[PDB]
Amino acid sequence: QSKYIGTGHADTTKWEWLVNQHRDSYCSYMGHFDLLNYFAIAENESKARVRFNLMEKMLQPCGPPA
Amino acid sequence: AREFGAGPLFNQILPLLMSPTLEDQERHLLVKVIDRILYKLDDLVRPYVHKILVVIEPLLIDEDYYARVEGREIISNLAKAAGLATMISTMRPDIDNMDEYVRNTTARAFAVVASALGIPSLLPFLKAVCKSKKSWQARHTGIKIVQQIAILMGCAILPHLRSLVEIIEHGLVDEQQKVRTISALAIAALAEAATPYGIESFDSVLKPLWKGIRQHRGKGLAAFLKAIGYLIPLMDAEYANYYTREVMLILIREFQSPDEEMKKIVLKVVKQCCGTDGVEANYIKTEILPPFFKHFWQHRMALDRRNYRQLVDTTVELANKVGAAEIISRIVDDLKDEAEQYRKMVMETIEKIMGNLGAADIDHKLEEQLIDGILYAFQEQTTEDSVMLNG
Amino acid sequence: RGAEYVSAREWMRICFELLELLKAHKKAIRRATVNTFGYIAKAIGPHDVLATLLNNLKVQERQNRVCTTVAIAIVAETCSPFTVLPALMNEYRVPELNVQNGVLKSLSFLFEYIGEMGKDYIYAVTPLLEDALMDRDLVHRQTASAVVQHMSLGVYGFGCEDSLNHLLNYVWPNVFETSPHVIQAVMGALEGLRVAIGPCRMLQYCLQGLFHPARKVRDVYWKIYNSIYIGSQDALIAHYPRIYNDDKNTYIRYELDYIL
Amino acid sequence: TVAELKQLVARPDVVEMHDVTAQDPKLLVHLKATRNSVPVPRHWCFKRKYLQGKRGIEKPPFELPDFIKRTGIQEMREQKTMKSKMREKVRPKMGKIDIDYQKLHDAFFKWQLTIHGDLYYEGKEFETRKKPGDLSDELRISLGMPVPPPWLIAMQRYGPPPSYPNLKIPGLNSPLYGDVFGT
Amino acid sequence: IKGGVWRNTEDEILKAAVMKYGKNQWSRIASLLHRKSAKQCKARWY
Amino acid sequence: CRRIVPGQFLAVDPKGRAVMISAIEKQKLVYILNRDAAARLTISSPLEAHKANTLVYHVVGVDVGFENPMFACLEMDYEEADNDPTGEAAANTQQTLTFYELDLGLNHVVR
Amino acid sequence: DLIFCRKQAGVAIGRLCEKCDGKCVICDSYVRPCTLVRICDECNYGSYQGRCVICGGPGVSDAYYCKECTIQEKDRDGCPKIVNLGSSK
Amino acid sequence: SSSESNRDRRERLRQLALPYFMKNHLGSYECKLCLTLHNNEGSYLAHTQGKKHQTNLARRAAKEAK
RNA sequence: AUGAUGUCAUACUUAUCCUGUCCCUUUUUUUUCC
Ligand SMILES: [Zn+2]
Ligand SMILES: [Zn+2]
Ligand SMILES: [Zn+2]
Ligand SMILES: [Zn+2]
């Protein structure tokens, strides 16, 4: 369980849980060709630049911790 | 546990588990209570670790198997339970201890703790030990530790194999004998758990070994033969062609020694060397088989257990190469021999042989001797066992 | 194999002799026994022999009763259970408790062996599970929960989820206890219910429990939420609710709000 | 403060006694009110271990679904001396149930709860789903009125009840079919 | 193996059994209890 | 589609000896390929490159002729970013390029 | 005392002895054998060739997973060769 | 099976000697005063034949008589 | 109106158990003579 990333426990903080679901959402975006293409349509960029901005947002999201 | 603390318990236990009159069961039960209390107590046991191991290390060397797997388990729980530095700093003074007993069982201890906390964590300790310039006994111990790590960890040695070799290599040339012997033995254990991979990691080790193969008398020689033996399957059929053809000579000459350690080694050797795809049948048929069935097939061997099994295997493989009718044809006449255990041996041998190669190779007359042999042997059964029947 | 050569009378005698072979201390004996009992169940037909199973005194624990239960299962397979169920479900009525939990087990193994065919009988078993899962004594909740599990794996994908949700209601309070067998039972239960119902409903029961002040509730709901989390982690994305952003952190994922 | 914390939520009612002790109330306030999620069961802070046998001793043993009742197995199942049992082995009689395989190929095909917004807890059985405006049949019989229950004629004069202030009962401020005369 | 400590359950059941069956039938009373014999039941009574 | 489960990025050796498969994070696996006695393709047992808390931008096969194969893994570590409440590690953190070396003889994958 | 080794799953086929022959490993059940067992040669090697995944006897057959563990996808975790918490031999 | 006869015989004996003891919707025996559950009625009866069960009836006796 | 402490007692659970199993404990002052 521990070595499986995303494992929660009783002491789990807000920040960690939400940054988890963030990163997992981003791996889903990298995963599904379409939804990615939807993103590229809406905000106009390349598929590439989209995935790049996401890979930048992987570590950050929500910004600094508390 | 958390209430009373480890101190009072062990103070009131270790005398009992140390008792001269101790049972089998009572022992095992006190082992159980030591486990169950050591699933809880973690930081607490630090002062008692040695005070535990002293009683427990005798469990590792024992005639009972279940006692051994228990012992390895509880030392695993202790080392992992305590800290690395706790174990290390604990167990040093037993390395140079006068008695070799504690040195040995201590080596198996380091094997267990190294399985617990992993090889790389404990490496610098060892690599420091085998280079100790004080006295040889230490290096002997540490090398034995390398071995027992090889046996215990086994297949999982693979990643650190290189570093381990780089440690052990310096003992092969040492002035003391033991260190050389146990060293090359440890190489053997490695390669046997190294089944084929990492050949070049053993690389720098070879050239001395082969040289030693020339000049040695006694047990150390046989040990080298053990190592080289497990090595050869890991070489290339071209290099191992030459090197093998060199080993075959000494292998031949050395069949005749009364040493049973010898006969074990050279036996398993003959398996690996002559079970090589790059070896020619006729050469074995001429040079080997007649001395092989002469010296090796005798009533000294079969009465023993390990020699029995290993003999079975080696003979099976020789059949796997030279073919069926040869081996069987030579050993059929022994089905009618007086003793049981011997008959049992040739019987299970015929069994495995005809299991693998198939009966198609067998001619007619030898088949008459077969069926008659099998009936005859089957008609006299002192004990109940499958070997004759499955056979 | 042959089974015709022998008249039925001999067979039923074989039955009444087979019944006490279940005292065997060996597992393979019981194995062959139950499988045979299925074979002769084919040679005769269900009703009589399943009645002879329901005769059982239950007298000792395991070592065994539940082997007779297995016979009830395999017997229910050998000819359609589509016949057999009403007798059993009626035999839950009996006030003797250990045979009540017995027939609960019979349903468990029953669905385990039938698999897909439970797309119908789910309804029949549903109210009885209601009565059983509503607790007389812990073993009821446990065994009934196991039934919910195997049912839940078996029916998957065929569109019966509704009644499984209803049963999930009554399953849900049992989450809390320290008894190992009932807690691991409930775990298996909610796992099968996870795959059958789909994660969304699960998570909608598991949200509030995560952050609740008490330690207990958090321990458990986080255990559950982990069980839901490891599998189907890919499909969870949509169902995380909207959580407002605080000072130092932005907790809104705006990607989903991009509109063409 | 548990006071002011109740100003930050759309449905502050969700905040409770021990809620103010939460490690992160500033969230749990926002979760517990999530749209379709369901409340945590209430059996904790009650130390009773989730059940007792008070109300559970008055329950029926079980009752079959009507689809299984029409079948007729119920009457077939229902006693024996020991020597009759060893005679039942030596004699043995076959075909006591003698079910109709047509019938048990019929019922569950030819013939043959709650929504998500509900969850069970310990003592709850009947009550929530006898209320002002909702009564049982028989007590209608004792009352003897043919298809308002007549003291909701006096709920005209004396006024709406203090006990259930939210009340509506038919014909007065509540503009009724079958039994249920008020909601 | 049968021998052991006397239990309130065994002892009360012994009261009831002795009341129902009578003093002179011990084998019948030992039949109901487990892990106890007739001699032990009689001597336990008297 | 997972965070830690491979299949995301895919690379292979020019000589086709060993194919390397990778996820976005934490798991990079290798399957070694050798034709059978009949020259029909047989696949080996997997290996493990596991490196904790490491994001993989892209993986590309590397050319070494009849050598111990190399692989180019773009990586980054967020473990610096999670433990830095200030937000400095958000900046001042450069993605690490690492070449893994498969080794046939030692039959593992070492950084 | 007895728990999985959970080393990475290889291509080696599982081997069960006489005793364990029919059992699906994790669910402990005999029902619906469907898919096949894989364990690493680190767990299966040498004296473990054709060894039982459990007791340590010679394997007479190959373990098949149930359909239950299939849909719950447990068969994809680390190699389910039980190790006693001493050595494996 | 002989074991089955004992269960039957020890229920009837605890029925004879028997107003508080009952059987719940399950099979267990219960004392309705003390709210105790009994494995066997005779085992339950002894608790029913005990001095604590005695008291709690008297206490409820007084508690009603007031 | 079920808290805690007690080696009273009985039910019950887990298709757990009851047949598998001996194989690297071989540890010593090097020492087998055309
Ligand atoms: Zn492994
Ligand atoms: Zn086995
Ligand atoms: Zn399974
Ligand atoms: Zn009472």
Side-chain angles (χ1 to χ4, degrees), chain A, chain B residues 1-53 55-391, chain C residues 1-56 63-135 137-260, chain D residues 1 3 5-6 9-10 12 15-16 19 21-22 25 27-28 30 32-34 36-41 43-47 50-51 53 56 59-66 68-69 71-73 76-77 80-81 83-84 87 90 92-95 98 100-101 103-110 113-114 117-118 120-123 126-128 132-133 136 138-140 142 144 146 148-151 154-155 159-162 164-165 167-176 178-180 182, chain E, chain F, chain G, chain H residues 1-3 5-6 9-10 16-17 19-20 23-25 27-28 31-34 36 42-43 46-48 50-53 55-56 58-62 65-66:
Chain A
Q1 295 178 337
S2 178
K3 290 184 171 73
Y4 181 80
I5 292 175
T7 301
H9 53 73
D11 293 344
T12 299
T13 61
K14 181 179 183 180
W15 184 85
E16 292 180 351
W17 188 80
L18 280 79
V19 67
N20 284 337
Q21 63 180 19
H22 284 83
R23 294 182 182 173
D24 286 343
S25 296
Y26 289 140
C27 295
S28 178
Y29 304 144
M30 301 294 289
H32 292 289
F33 55 95
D34 275 345
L35 175 60
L36 177 59
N37 293 337
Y38 177 81
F39 293 162
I41 295 168
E43 56 182 341
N44 189 338
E45 289 298 320
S46 68
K47 296 176 180 177
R49 293 298 301 275
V50 172
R51 293 198 296 269
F52 177 76
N53 294 283
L54 294 177
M55 295 300 294
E56 293 300 321
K57 295 175 180 177
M58 289 299 294
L59 60 81
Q60 186 171 354
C62 303
Chain B
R2 300 285 291 173
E3 184 180 3
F4 298 159
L9 272 70
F10 296 155
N11 285 334
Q12 187 167 346
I13 291 173
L14 297 176
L16 287 175
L17 189 59
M18 182 69 79
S19 67
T21 61
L22 178 62
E23 296 295 320
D24 285 344
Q25 285 301 320
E26 291 179 348
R27 185 185 67 194
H28 186 65
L29 271 59
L30 271 64
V31 175
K32 294 299 184 181
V33 67
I34 288 173
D35 273 339
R36 297 177 66 86
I37 65 170
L38 289 178
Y39 180 80
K40 304 299 183 180
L41 303 181
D42 185 67
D43 291 344
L44 282 71
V45 301
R46 297 183 180 278
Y48 297 92
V49 175
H50 182 63
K51 193 187 295 292
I52 299 299
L53 293 175
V55 175
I56 300 306
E57 288 184 352
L59 296 176
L60 265 60
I61 61 105
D62 184 4
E63 298 174 351
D64 183 4
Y65 173 76
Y66 292 85
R68 292 196 300 275
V69 61
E70 292 301 322
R72 290 197 296 273
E73 183 177 1
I74 81 166
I75 292 174
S76 300
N77 293 282
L78 176 62
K80 176 56 167 60
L84 176 60
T86 304
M87 299 302 296
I88 295 172
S89 301
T90 296
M91 294 177 67
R92 173 176 289 277
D94 291 345
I95 300 301
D96 60 10
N97 188 339
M98 179 64 74
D99 180 2
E100 190 182 6
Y101 173 77
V102 292
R103 294 200 295 270
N104 188 24
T105 188
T106 298
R108 292 183 181 84
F110 280 96
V112 176
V113 310
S115 64
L117 295 175
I119 306 301
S121 63
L122 198 145
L123 288 178
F125 179 77
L126 292 174
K127 184 178 172 63
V129 174
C130 291
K131 288 185 293 186
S132 177
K133 63 188 181 71
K134 286 182 174 180
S135 64
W136 59 269
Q137 296 81 352
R139 291 179 293 107
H140 180 64
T141 296
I143 287 173
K144 289 184 67 66
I145 297 170
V146 179
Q147 185 173 355
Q148 299 305 321
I149 291 169
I151 291 170
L152 179 57
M153 292 303 296
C155 51
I157 297 166
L158 184 63
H160 294 81
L161 176 62
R162 183 178 178 83
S163 293
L164 297 176
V165 173
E166 294 173 350
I167 294 171
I168 186 172
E169 65 180 342
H170 66 283
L172 295 170
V173 296
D174 186 4
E175 299 176 353
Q176 184 65 260
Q177 182 160 350
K178 289 187 175 77
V179 57
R180 295 194 302 275
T181 299
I182 186 64
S183 66
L185 291 175
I187 296 298
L190 290 175
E192 183 174 0
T195 322
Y197 288 111
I199 179 66
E200 289 85 0
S201 293
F202 297 96
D203 187 4
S204 62
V205 181
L206 295 175
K207 291 188 70 66
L209 295 177
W210 176 78
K211 184 178 293 295
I213 294 300
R214 294 186 182 178
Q215 67 178 22
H216 286 81
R217 295 179 182 274
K219 299 170 183 175
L221 181 63
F224 298 165
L225 273 63
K226 189 183 178 68
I228 305 303
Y230 291 94
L231 290 176
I232 291 172
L234 279 67
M235 293 189 285
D236 290 344
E238 292 78 356
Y239 181 76
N241 187 31
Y242 170 75
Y243 189 81
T244 299
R245 296 179 184 276
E246 181 66 12
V247 181
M248 292 296 180
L249 276 67
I250 300 100
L251 179 64
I252 296 300
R253 177 183 62 194
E254 291 303 321
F255 289 159
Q256 63 181 19
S257 179
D259 181 5
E260 293 303 321
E261 294 178 350
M262 191 71 179
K263 294 167 66 181
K264 293 176 180 176
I265 303 303
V266 303
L267 181 58
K268 185 64 171 174
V269 173
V270 172
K271 175 180 176 179
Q272 288 171 332
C273 296
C274 302
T276 301
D277 293 344
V279 180
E280 296 81 357
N282 187 28
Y283 176 74
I284 294 170
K285 182 186 292 179
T286 302
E287 298 298 320
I288 296 171
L289 296 175
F292 182 79
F293 293 161
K294 183 185 291 179
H295 294 80
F296 289 96
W297 287 84
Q298 296 303 323
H299 294 82
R300 293 191 301 275
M301 298 297 288
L303 297 177
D304 189 2
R305 189 73 63 182
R306 291 189 299 275
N307 292 338
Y308 169 78
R309 287 179 57 81
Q310 191 67 264
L311 175 59
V312 173
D313 290 344
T314 297
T315 300
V316 171
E317 293 303 323
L318 295 179
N320 285 333
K321 182 175 290 294
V322 68
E326 181 65 16
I327 304 304
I328 293 173
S329 63
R330 291 181 178 274
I331 57 174
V332 170
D333 299 346
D334 292 345
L335 291 176
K336 295 180 70 67
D337 191 5
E338 292 302 324
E340 179 183 2
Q341 186 66 259
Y342 187 78
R343 291 182 296 106
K344 180 178 178 180
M345 178 174 69
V346 299
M347 178 66 181
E348 186 176 3
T349 296
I350 294 171
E351 184 279 335
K352 292 181 182 297
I353 292 172
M354 292 181 70
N356 287 340
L357 274 67
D361 180 64
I362 300 169
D363 63 12
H364 183 62
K365 291 174 295 300
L366 177 64
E367 182 179 1
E368 290 181 350
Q369 292 176 336
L370 285 173
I371 299 301
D372 187 12
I374 309 300
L375 288 172
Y376 171 75
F378 171 78
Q379 291 178 340
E380 52 187 340
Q381 293 296 320
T382 62
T383 60
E384 67 284 5
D385 51 354
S386 64
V387 56
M388 300 301 296
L389 184 61
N390 284 332
Chain C
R1 296 178 65 185
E4 71 264 356
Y5 300 90
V6 174
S7 65
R9 190 67 66 191
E10 305 299 319
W11 292 105
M12 178 57 72
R13 186 184 68 258
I14 296 170
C15 296
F16 296 163
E17 183 65 13
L18 289 172
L19 193 147
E20 75 280 5
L21 291 175
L22 302 175
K23 189 189 294 179
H25 300 166
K26 184 180 293 297
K27 190 179 178 181
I29 296 170
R30 289 171 293 185
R31 186 66 49 183
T33 301
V34 178
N35 291 337
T36 60
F37 194 85
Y39 298 140
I40 63 177
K42 177 177 289 295
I44 296 173
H47 300 292
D48 52 355
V49 297
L50 70 89
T52 60
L53 294 176
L54 296 177
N55 289 336
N56 284 284
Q63 301 310 315
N64 209 343
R65 179 189 300 174
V66 72
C67 284
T68 59
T69 296
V70 178
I72 297 171
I74 292 173
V75 165
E77 193 283 336
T78 187
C79 297
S80 63
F82 191 69
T83 57
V84 307
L85 279 179
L88 192 148
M89 291 183 67
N90 192 343
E91 295 307 319
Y92 178 79
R93 289 184 179 176
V94 295
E96 190 177 5
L97 186 144
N98 55 345
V99 295
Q100 296 173 337
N101 290 332
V103 299
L104 293 176
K105 295 300 289 185
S106 69
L107 290 172
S108 178
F109 292 160
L110 174 61
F111 290 95
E112 181 176 0
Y113 289 95
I114 64 172
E116 67 179 342
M117 295 178 72
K119 66 181 179 182
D120 293 342
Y121 278 134
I122 176 171
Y123 305 140
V125 181
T126 50
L128 189 145
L129 289 173
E130 296 178 351
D131 188 6
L133 184 60
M134 170 64 183
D135 186 12
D137 188 3
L138 273 65
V139 179
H140 295 287
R141 302 199 306 262
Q142 181 172 352
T143 60
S145 299
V147 178
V148 179
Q149 183 174 353
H150 296 163
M151 292 178 71
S152 182
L153 290 176
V155 180
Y156 177 77
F158 293 162
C160 296
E161 298 84 359
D162 58 10
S163 60
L164 292 172
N165 186 31
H166 174 61
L167 272 60
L168 174 62
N169 290 337
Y170 297 141
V171 173
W172 187 251
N174 301 341
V175 167
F176 294 89
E177 184 63 14
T178 59
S179 296
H181 293 87
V182 67
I183 190 66
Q184 66 183 21
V186 168
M187 290 299 101
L190 293 175
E191 183 176 359
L193 294 173
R194 176 180 66 84
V195 294
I197 305 300
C200 183
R201 190 68 70 188
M202 300 299 106
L203 178 64
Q204 284 183 332
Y205 289 141
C206 188
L207 287 178
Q208 301 176 341
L210 291 175
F211 297 149
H212 188 278
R215 179 178 292 277
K216 302 179 185 300
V217 55
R218 287 182 290 103
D219 297 341
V220 182
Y221 281 82
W222 278 99
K223 181 180 292 295
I224 293 171
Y225 178 79
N226 286 335
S227 177
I228 300 171
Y229 184 80
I230 294 170
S232 66
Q233 184 175 354
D234 190 7
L236 297 171
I237 302 301
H239 309 295
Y240 293 136
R242 187 179 299 278
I243 294 171
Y244 300 138
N245 56 346
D246 61 354
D247 180 67
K248 290 180 178 178
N249 291 279
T250 300
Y251 292 136
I252 299 298
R253 294 170 298 177
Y254 297 90
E255 299 84 358
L256 303 178
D257 282 342
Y258 303 150
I259 296 302
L260 299 177
Chain D
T1 68
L5 177 63
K6 295 179 179 297
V9 179
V15 303
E16 299 304 323
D19 290 346
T21 205
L27 188 150
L28 186 148
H30 297 288
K32 184 179 294 296
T34 304
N36 291 339
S37 296
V38 271
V40 62
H43 65 284
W44 58 271
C45 74
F46 298 97
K47 293 183 175 73
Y50 173 76
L51 281 176
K59 63 178 291 181
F62 182 81
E63 188 173 3
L64 271 61
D66 61 353
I68 302 168
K69 187 185 295 179
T71 59
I73 291 99
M76 297 304 296
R77 298 301 300 275
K80 298 292 181 63
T81 63
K83 183 172 294 299
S84 178
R87 176 58 61 182
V90 173
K93 174 61 175 172
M94 299 296 291
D98 189 3
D100 184 5
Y101 300 91
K103 290 183 172 73
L104 296 173
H105 196 282
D106 283 342
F108 299 104
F109 282 169
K110 178 179 63 63
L113 306 177
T114 285
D118 291 345
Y120 174 80
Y121 60 91
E122 179 175 4
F126 183 80
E127 290 181 349
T128 304
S136 65
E138 183 171 20
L139 178 62
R140 179 228 275 316
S142 27
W151 71 79
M155 289 176 165
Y164 285 112
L167 180 60
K168 306 298 178 182
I169 281 178
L172 282 67
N173 55 1
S174 189
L176 160 60
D179 283 341
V180 183
Chain E
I1 295 171
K2 303 301 285 185
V5 296
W6 284 90
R7 291 170 173 78
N8 288 336
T9 298
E10 293 176 349
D11 186 67
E12 299 302 320
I13 291 173
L14 180 63
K15 289 179 178 295
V18 172
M19 182 177 283
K20 180 174 179 289
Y21 292 90
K23 293 178 179 177
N24 287 335
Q25 295 171 332
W26 291 104
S27 65
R28 306 187 190 280
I29 292 171
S31 65
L32 194 149
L33 297 173
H34 300 290
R35 291 166 293 182
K36 293 292 174 61
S37 62
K39 181 188 293 179
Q40 297 173 334
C41 291
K42 181 170 180 290
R44 187 65 172 85
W45 178 260
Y46 288 88
Chain F
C1 296
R2 297 292 186 86
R3 179 179 178 172
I4 62 169
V5 173
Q8 184 59 57
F9 299 103
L10 181 63
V12 63
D13 182 71
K15 298 296 184 179
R17 292 194 299 275
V19 58
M20 177 174 172
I21 182 171
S22 62
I24 297 170
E25 181 179 359
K26 182 179 179 289
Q27 292 188 340
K28 285 175 288 297
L29 305 179
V30 175
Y31 289 129
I32 295 171
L33 297 176
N34 285 282
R35 57 185 177 87
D36 63 356
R40 181 174 178 269
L41 177 63
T42 58
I43 184 168
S44 66
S45 297
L47 298 175
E48 289 181 346
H50 299 293
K51 176 58 166 58
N53 298 131
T54 303
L55 296 172
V56 175
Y57 291 90
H58 191 200
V59 174
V60 178
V62 179
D63 183 8
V64 290
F66 292 87
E67 296 301 319
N68 284 336
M70 295 293 182
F71 293 96
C73 57
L74 292 174
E75 293 180 350
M76 182 176 281
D77 186 6
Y78 58 90
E79 184 176 0
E80 292 177 349
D82 291 344
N83 290 282
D84 185 2
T86 59
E88 294 175 348
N92 66 40
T93 302
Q94 67 284 1
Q95 61 180 23
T96 60
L97 169 62
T98 57
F99 299 156
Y100 297 147
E101 181 182 4
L102 187 148
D103 189 4
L104 281 73
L106 274 65
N107 195 33
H108 73 286
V109 177
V110 62
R111 296 184 63 188
Chain G
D1 189 3
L2 296 173
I3 194 168
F4 297 96
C5 186
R6 295 295 179 189
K7 290 178 179 178
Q8 183 58 260
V11 296
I13 308 304
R15 301 295 298 276
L16 291 179
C17 64
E18 180 179 2
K19 179 177 62 63
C20 297
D21 182 7
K23 291 192 297 184
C24 179
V25 174
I26 295 172
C27 66
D28 295 345
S29 178
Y30 297 105
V31 300
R32 289 177 174 83
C34 182
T35 57
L36 183 63
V37 173
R38 298 291 179 87
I39 59 173
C40 60
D41 284 342
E42 298 301 319
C43 287
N44 186 338
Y45 164 76
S47 296
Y48 303 142
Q49 185 67 58
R51 189 68 66 185
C52 181
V53 178
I54 305 303
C55 60
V60 298
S61 65
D62 295 345
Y64 297 143
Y65 288 100
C66 60
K67 185 177 179 179
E68 291 177 348
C69 296
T70 301
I71 299 170
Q72 294 179 338
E73 297 175 350
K74 291 180 177 178
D75 59 354
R76 300 180 183 176
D77 291 344
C79 57
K81 181 178 170 63
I82 300 298
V83 293
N84 189 337
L85 287 178
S87 179
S88 178
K89 282 178 180 178
Chain H
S1 16
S2 155
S3 69
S5 285
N6 286 356
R9 164 198 310 190
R10 291 176 56 256
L16 291 208
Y20 292 118
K23 290 181 163 198
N24 52 28
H25 67 288
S28 271
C31 96
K32 195 176 286 179
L33 258 65
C34 296
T36 63
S43 267
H47 161 41
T48 296
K51 68 191 68 202
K52 183 169 82 163
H53 185 123
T55 294
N56 285 274
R59 294 173 66 254
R60 180 178 298 279
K66 61 185 294 185

